[PDB]
Ligand binder design. Structure first.
Ligand code: C2E
Ligand code: C2E
Lengths: 260, 80
């Protein structure tokens, strides 16, 4: 019927004082917290202070029998995610949501409740009319690349798909989730629209997808490479390196997430 | 209040080990089922190349393998 709405300053002191402020405001017994932080709000918090704050929050939750949920919109929280994993004792559930254009991927590192404990689950949830509904990793091994990248070479494995140009490649990568996308650069005119395609491939598709650009002709500058990196590409393969160097660079980004 | 819960049930010839959850500095596991055997008083856990490519590292001019089926060799003696 009713809930309490609370506003705090966008500062570390607000998070630090949250406990005392709510104690002065609300009796936390049988009461739920939903902390919706701003974009990259948990980026300025140091590791040790974050651990101490989490420990204090867990102790307060146990003492007051209150449950706390924190939703943090961020893109470079991999180190923070590792820190959360290291403090699994205080925590009792960690979930991440990755946007993949048409669907969202929910990864639960661990979860403990009255009905049991689950660890390392991966599920797909979609947003239908503003409602989050589960849909009842899969293409990580698959590699998508341009024909000109291989310089005529056939598909190196079953997980290899070749495309004539970097237009149908982007269309296929729209459907792919964790496949490795490799582009080909031939002239200067391809720098900008391929950059746009990479931007879309990093906005629609999260950090799970691997984006790579192979340079086949010496038509690149440092600024263009920086722009490609900023658009979401993991790295741009120089034209000087042979094809096998490109392939091992592709292998390097396997199992890696674009945290920038 | 538990960092790991395990049960060992006798099943005639081998024992079934069911871990509901387990915490460790290397990670946390949940709902593991394994089979162990007591051999002389010791609990022990129970237990084509057409596409694989073997080439020298100098075949790729020192570059790492193309794919999973590619395996490199420093000189043409380990490869042999
Ligand atoms: N050796 C050398 N000459 C240079 C360099 N920068 C400019 N020039 C000379 O200046 C002309 C104008 O280039 P821009 O104004 O930078 O405008 C350039 C630039 O925007 C682009 N472009 C040409 N080559 C490349 C390339 O290899 N990479 C990139 N990213 N853009 C290039 O096309 C335009 C026309 O350039 P060009 O037809 O080559 O004609 C070039 C070239 O004769 C340089 O770093 N090295
Ligand atoms: N401000 C300024 N810097 C200059 C100029 N000429 C060379 N540089 C600098 O020199 C670097 C490498 O020398 P490069 O032989 O031009 O190495 C160039 C060149 O071989 C080629 N290139 C790039 N743009 C052009 C262009 O417009 N024309 C031609 N012909 N080649 C270009 O691509 C390479 C990559 O260049 P970058 O990564 O941008 O890195 C370039 C750039 O920072 C110039 O007129 N003005």
């Amino acid at each position: 019927e009713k809930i309490k709405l609370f506003s705090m300053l966008n500062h570390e002191k607000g998070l630090y004082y949250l406990t005392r402020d709510l104690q002065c405001s609300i009796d936390p017994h049988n009461y739920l917290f939903i902390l919706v932080c701003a974009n990259n709000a948990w980026q300025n918090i140091p590791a040790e202070r974050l651990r101490s704050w989490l420990d204090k929050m867990n102790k307060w939750s146990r003492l007051n029998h209150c449950s706390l949920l924190v939703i943090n919109p961020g893109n470079n929280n991999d180190k923070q995610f590792s820190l959360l994993l290291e403090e699994y004792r205080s925590l009792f559930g960690l979930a991440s949501l990755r946007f993949q254009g048409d669907q969202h991927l929910l990864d639960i590192a661990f979860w403990c409740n009255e009905k049991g404990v689950s660890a390392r689950q991966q599920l797909s949830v979609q947003q239908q009319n503003g409602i989050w509904t589960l849909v009842q990793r899969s293409d990580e091994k698959r590699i998508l690349s341009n024909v000109a990248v291989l310089e005529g070479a056939p598909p190196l494995s079953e997980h290899w798909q070749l495309f004539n140009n970097n237009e149908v490649l982007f269309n296929e990568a729209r459907t792919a989730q964790a496949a490795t996308v490799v582009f080909s650069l031939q002239q200067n005119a391809q720098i900008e629209p391929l950059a746009r395609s990479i931007h879309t491939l990093r906005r629609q598709r999260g950090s799970a997808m691997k984006i790579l650009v192979r340079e086949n002709t010496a038509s690149l500058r440092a600024t263009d490479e920086r722009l490609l990196l900023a658009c979401g590409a993991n790295m741009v393969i120089p034209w000087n390196a042979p094809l096998s160097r490109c392939l091992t660079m592709i292998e390097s980004v396997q199992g890696q997430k674009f945290s920038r």
